[PDB]
Amino acid sequence: MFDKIDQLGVNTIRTLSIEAVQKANSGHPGLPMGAAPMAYALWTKHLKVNPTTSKNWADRDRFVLSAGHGSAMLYSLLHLAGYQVTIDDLKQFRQWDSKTPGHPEVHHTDGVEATTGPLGQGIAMAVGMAMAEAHLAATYNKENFNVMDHYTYAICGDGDLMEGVSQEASSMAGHMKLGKLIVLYDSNDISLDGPTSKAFTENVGARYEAYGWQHILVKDGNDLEAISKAIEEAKAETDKPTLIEVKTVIGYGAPKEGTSAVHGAPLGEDGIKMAKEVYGWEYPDFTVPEEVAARFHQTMIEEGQKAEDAWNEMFANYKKAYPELAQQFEDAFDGKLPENWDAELPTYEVGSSQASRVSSKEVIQELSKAIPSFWGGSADLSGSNNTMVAADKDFTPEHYEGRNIWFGVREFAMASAMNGIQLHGGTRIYGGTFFVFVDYLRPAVRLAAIQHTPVVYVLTHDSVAVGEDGPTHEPIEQLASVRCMPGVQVIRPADGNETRAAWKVAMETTDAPTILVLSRQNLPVLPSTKEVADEMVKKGAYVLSPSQGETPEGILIATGSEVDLAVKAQKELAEKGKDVSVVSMPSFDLFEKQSSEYKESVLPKSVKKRVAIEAAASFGWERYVGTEGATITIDHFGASAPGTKILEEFGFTVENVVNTYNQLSE
Amino acid sequence: MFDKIDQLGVNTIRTLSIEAVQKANSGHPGLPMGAAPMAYALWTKHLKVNPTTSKNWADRDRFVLSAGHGSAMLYSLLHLAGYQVTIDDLKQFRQWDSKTPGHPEVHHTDGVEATTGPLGQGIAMAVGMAMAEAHLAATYNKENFNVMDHYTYAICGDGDLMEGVSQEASSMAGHMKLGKLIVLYDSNDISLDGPTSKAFTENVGARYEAYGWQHILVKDGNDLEAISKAIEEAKAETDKPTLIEVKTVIGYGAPKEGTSAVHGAPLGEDGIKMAKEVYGWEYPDFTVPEEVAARFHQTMIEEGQKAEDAWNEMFANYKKAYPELAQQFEDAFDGKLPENWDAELPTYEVGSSQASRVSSKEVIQELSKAIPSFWGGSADLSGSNNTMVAADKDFTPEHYEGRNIWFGVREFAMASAMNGIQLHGGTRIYGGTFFVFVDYLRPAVRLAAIQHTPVVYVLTHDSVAVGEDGPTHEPIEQLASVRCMPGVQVIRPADGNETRAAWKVAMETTDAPTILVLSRQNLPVLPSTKEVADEMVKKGAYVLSPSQGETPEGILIATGSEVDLAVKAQKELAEKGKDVSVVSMPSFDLFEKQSSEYKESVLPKSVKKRVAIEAAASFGWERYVGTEGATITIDHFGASAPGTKILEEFGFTVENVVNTYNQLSENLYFQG
Ligand SMILES: Cc1ncc(C[n+]2csc(CCOP(=O)(O)OP(=O)(O)O)c2C)c(N)n1
Ligand SMILES: Cc1ncc(C[n+]2csc(CCOP(=O)(O)OP(=O)(O)O)c2C)c(N)n1
Ligand SMILES: [Mg+2]
Ligand SMILES: [Mg+2]
Questions:
Q1: CA–CA separation, B512 vs B187, rounded Å?
Q2: Atom 10 of ligand 2 has which residue's CA nearest to it?
Q3: Where along this sequence does the record place binding of Mg(2+) (chain B) (predicted)?
Q4: Radius of gyration from C-alpha coordinates of chain B
């Protein structure tokens, strides 16, 4: 059962958390106090992790604290568990260069599996982690070798479940029958501003039951045994994901328990003392009882070591029995793209005019054949986005080996799950939606930037050329909205050859989300792209068509579909005697990470006659065009019309670029 | 209650819709074919509208087509109703400058209450409209006067209900017991990519029942009587919102019915004819049967005018009985601000330091007192956003007159509901969360910009000064992310006086959403603001502190929290004989609106020594600092540390401002 030492451990977590919040004079103490029993039971009796090996173990049970305001409890848990969070690390909570940030951040603190500040994304990321385990289990598990047999756990709050991303993810998870996803809900019945009664009165468990989820109610948050029994029931439900609703008194033992006051402000030294009185805690501050430390050592370090060693031996036998597949497992988790992966990648010729999206599909198809760890889907847009791998099955409960994922019209959930799949390891994911609906998945793109996750976004329908669907479905500001974001690689391919090479950047990217901005409209193949694209797209901007002279009199900058106008302009300008360089800038960010010498080759400082043609906003174009430069952009919303007409009416004609260049030349 | 004329009316809606899609060679015919029965039953027998008065009747039932891909069904319906959509307009479906755009757009087309292309937002706008009815009903309705008694209707498809904004809003709707909101769900069991078996196996009704909704399942989508019966049941359940799931066959009649093919592509002429054979339609193309037109005229034109006229008589009697409330009702709907709304607004002194969030609370609360229509709330962040009005009560089922809305942690739903509230009219809406979570509500900001809807966004915690919550809670790219967007007014107030003016700009803005970017940290009151802010913040950028002498040697440009550093740096630079002008730029948008002449006053082209200091991404600052100017900016994510420290390490110190300017002298440019 659960002994007195076990309750000491619970209260150690409680005291460490609340002390850490107080020293910082910042932080959230209520959830740590309320959720400390459910956390303790999970880690000590049910979570299989080897703290000694950190996150290196592939089959570690995955735990996400979606309610990141409980960071102090997680740090308390990592310290007790044997991860490298020290007592002094706890004391530096919410301080400069601390290993204990106010909200958990992956790769900043040992043992944190996800960056979980924003609400609902952690659940969705945990959904994706179970998707990955089911997929990798089906892909690699053979009889007598359970190479992937682990559970995804999350601890959420009332806020996580009021967010659409979780609701989207939970319907997804229920559909995908993720029996190994166990979410613990800290139903403290309170939120930041007050009681759940003022805005959140739904039957969460019934909703989850409608999604296909098992719902277990533990009416006593402080009954460890009831929580441990619930986890076992959830593990027994192999066909359905499980929500264990743990009713807790936020700030348990504190004077202001069951109020919003304990949510986000330090309890105060009065609160700590009174809470300790309830616990009978007369221990010194930032002190862990010896009994507790040994309990955590036996329960987590010792058992964890035995489990990984056992798994490691099974993999040893697995490698002998199935050498090629085991190596694949190893290479996928280490992010090693297969040899000659790019060999059969499509190439295109000057006669051709193919949409960037069709070109993407072709790259995707060969990528899927070559890379067995490559998988992905769309938000009900695979036909429109051309994100489907023909010759591969769909990712279904019946065939988890399938690598085509039907996310549904759940873009945010797709994006966050994708972040979780990347975080899990063994897979490279892509996700498809229209470019205008990047808005829906934007917070998860920002999480991917912070988390340095090599997610690929296949976002199509880049411009007003979509046409008849109209302003709501035509991106204008979306290219700028991603470019300001730190940590995101945004590439708009200008032809098929640029598209192939953009995918190659994404495949070879290991620390950044990559957004691919692709076109519905058919894209004519440009002059040098067949030969130079693979080498020069990664440089962000290159001289697609050079001027006749060493120094161009002017320079035309263009991205994507509008680079064709540029080359046609170059010739018309030549007939009137003007010599201009045409630069393809697929990516702003890739270009800025290049040398000053390279930037000079593409955009020489001498030439102030810079005209930029982009079917997008003008924001940030003065960086390259200049104060004195000119730009053909759209700074207004779209229209419902044949796309060819909208472009023509919005100034994307060879004649207009000539006139604007000539006016600037004056 | 339904005759062959009514089925012919259903077939008419379908034929006009599929014929228009084919002429355009673009569109979605599937939902029109299967949903035209349910649309017909609701409009002809349960929807209280006067087509003659367009969108000008205040107690009109509100219909939102959340599934915008079924635009043609709406346009067909508008023509049949008596709205100003001609057969000729339908022919121009999805063509340049048409009154029939591919997805419905408000204002462009008669009687379209919302721009509803993006999925889920329409149901959320509908939810907010029901919120607006309840508040206005409670605020204005008095005994024997049913000033506000209108239901809110939305038609959605599977995709709408998969989206999280819908799920948030539905939870919010059930909590708020908006029993007069009824959603009609095309359970066609098909999505763009294919069946819903592949992505959508949930029990929608069970979820909606958990939300506190009522679920009526109509198994025969073609049975008009059953649909109408369900709409009656829904109106009967006044304490619960209702989802009427009408199971339909997508593309009923076409050869490709019940498949993904009918969703988003023209059937083709053969398909139109084959469906017509099932329909028994021998009529020529783009034709309304005379029987159907007269049936529509009777059901909606004549009855609707009688209802608006009956309402108008009651309102006039209400005007006599309650003149004050009636004038307020008209003026609130008219958008007229009360006469002395600006009079009691807070003013602040140089010796004062206060966070713009606290300044906003004070401006809000006085605005609430003077403007009865003014209401709003936050996504569980009122303590942090300072968005609560102390005098007023919460907007609860018990107190629908309350002007404090608790949206919960539902930012997307809040912003879309806000859009519905403003579109409905009678109220001014503010909604609050952290500025870093605009990303959560971003699609609804865009829809507001396209809809020209004057929603006010109170987005606080603007910088790395948030501090210990960390990178995830600290905005960086967000300012540029909305300054890049068309049709949005983004004001970063630099002190309390600018904050008041910012609110004023938003209260006087009728054509655009306004985002107010406010600070957790205390902002010291700046030199000229108590006197010049009321007239100069509206100009976007102004010279807060002029140079000593007409032509400045440099421009220190700063927005929001960072302007104080610029003024302090001006002093230090002035002490060393360097004369710079401090330009405060609350809004990029408002400044570019001003005359070419005014811009030269604020930013003379002659002065090329410019340093811009803003604790945000450098994106788009090259427009003002210039190629040879410099920026003190954050192009990287933040940290978890006390906020003052983060700012110092990131260079928002007086020394760095001085030194960045001085290094500008070292350049070869600026030598000469
Ligand atoms: C998307 C998002 N919006 C807002 C916040 C701010 N926030 C953090 S916790 C919280 C309250 C949610 O309540 P709950 O999870 O029940 O908290 P508890 O009572 O357990 O502390 C809010 C609004 C956030 N972290 N993420
Ligand atoms: C937010 C958003 N995501 C995606 C799309 C693209 N889209 C339009 S309809 C649709 C399929 C949804 O199917 P459903 O609403 O059930 O359509 P029906 O079968 O009734 O035509 C998709 C993905 C969109 N318009 N908005
Ligand atoms: Mg809670
Ligand atoms: Mg459908």
A1: 35
A2: B192
A3: 158, 188, 190
A4: 28
**DSSP SS3 for B382:** helix
- Binding-face residues of A in 455-484 toward B, CB within 8 A: 467-473, 476-477, 480-481, 483-484
Question: In Å, what resolution does this model reach?
Answer: 2.9
The C-alpha angle with vertex B27 and arms to B282 and A352, in degrees rounded to 5, equals: 125
Distance (Å, whole) CA B116 – CA B34: 19
CATH number given to B353-524: 3.40.50.970
Domain A541-665, architecture per CATH: 3-Layer(aba) Sandwich (3.40)
Residue type, A336: K
* DSSP class per residue in B428-464: EEEEEEEGGGTTTTHHHHHHHHHHT---EEEEE--SG
Tell which residue, A284, A260, A264, has the closest CA to residue A94.
A264
Strand partners, B612: B557, B631
Q: Element (H or E) spanning A633, and its range?
A: none
C-alpha angle B224/B229/B234, rounded to 5°? Answer: 125
Domain ranges across chain A: 4-306, 353-524, 541-665
Answer positive or negative: Cα dihedral of A229, A235, A240, A243.
Answer: positive
Pocket lining: B69 vs ligand 2, CB cutoff 6 Å: yes
Ligand 2 centroid, distance to B386 Cα (angstroms): 38
What is the residue type of B301? I
Q: By the 8 A CB rule, do A34 and A251 touch?
A: yes
Query: Is position B649 annotated as part of the catalytic site?
Result: no
B538-666 CATH: 3.40.50.920
Q: What is the DSSP string of A435-479?
A: GGGHHHHHHHHHHHHHHT---EEEEE--SGGG-TT-GGGS-SSHH
DSSP H helices in B576-638: 588-593, 596-602, 622-625
Same fold, B4-306 and B538-666: yes
Please tell me the experimental approach by which this structure was elucidated: X-ray
Rounded Cα gap, residues B246 and B241, in angstroms: 16
Q: How far apart are CA B215 and CA B205, in angstroms?
A: 5
- Which residue lies with its CA nearest to atom 10 of ligand 1? A192
Query: A191 in contact with B at a CB cutoff of 8 Å?
Result: yes
Mutation to probe ligand 2, out of A380, A433, A459 (largest number of atoms < 8 A from CB): A380
The strand order across the sheet containing A580-584 reads: A542-545, A580-584, A554-558, A610-613, A630-632
B665 with B573: CB under 8 angstroms?
Answer: no
| Nearest ligand to residue B117 Cα | 2
| Whole-number Å distance between alpha carbons of B464 and B473 | 8
Q: Is A27 on the interface with B (CB under 8 A)?
A: yes
Among A554, A560, A528, A530, which Cα is nearest to A543's? A528
Q: How far apart are CA A614 and CA A565, in angstroms?
A: 10
CB B250 less than 6 A from any atom of ligand 2: yes
Query: The tokens of A381 are what?
Result: 């847009």
Distance of alpha carbon B366 from the chain centroid: 24
Contacts of A164 in chain B (CB under 8 A): 120, 163-168, 410, 412-413
CA of B540 to the centre of ligand 4 (A): 46
CATH C-level class of A4-306: alpha beta
Nearest Cα neighbor of A123 from A150, A70, A161 is A161
Query: Using a CB-CB distance cutoff of 8 angstroms, which residues of chain B are in contact with residue A381?
Result: 192-193
Answer yes or no: are the C-beta atoms of A495 and A529 closer than 8 Å: yes
Nearest CA in chain B to A117: B472
The number of the ligand 1 atom at minimal distance from the alpha carbon of A158 is 16
Query: Cα(A247)–Cα(B493) distance, rounded to whole angstroms?
Result: 43
Which position among B411, B498, B562, B614 bears the catalytic label? Answer: B411
Q: Within the 82-111 window of chain A, which residues sit less than 8 Å (CB to CB) from chain B?
A: 94-98, 101-103, 105
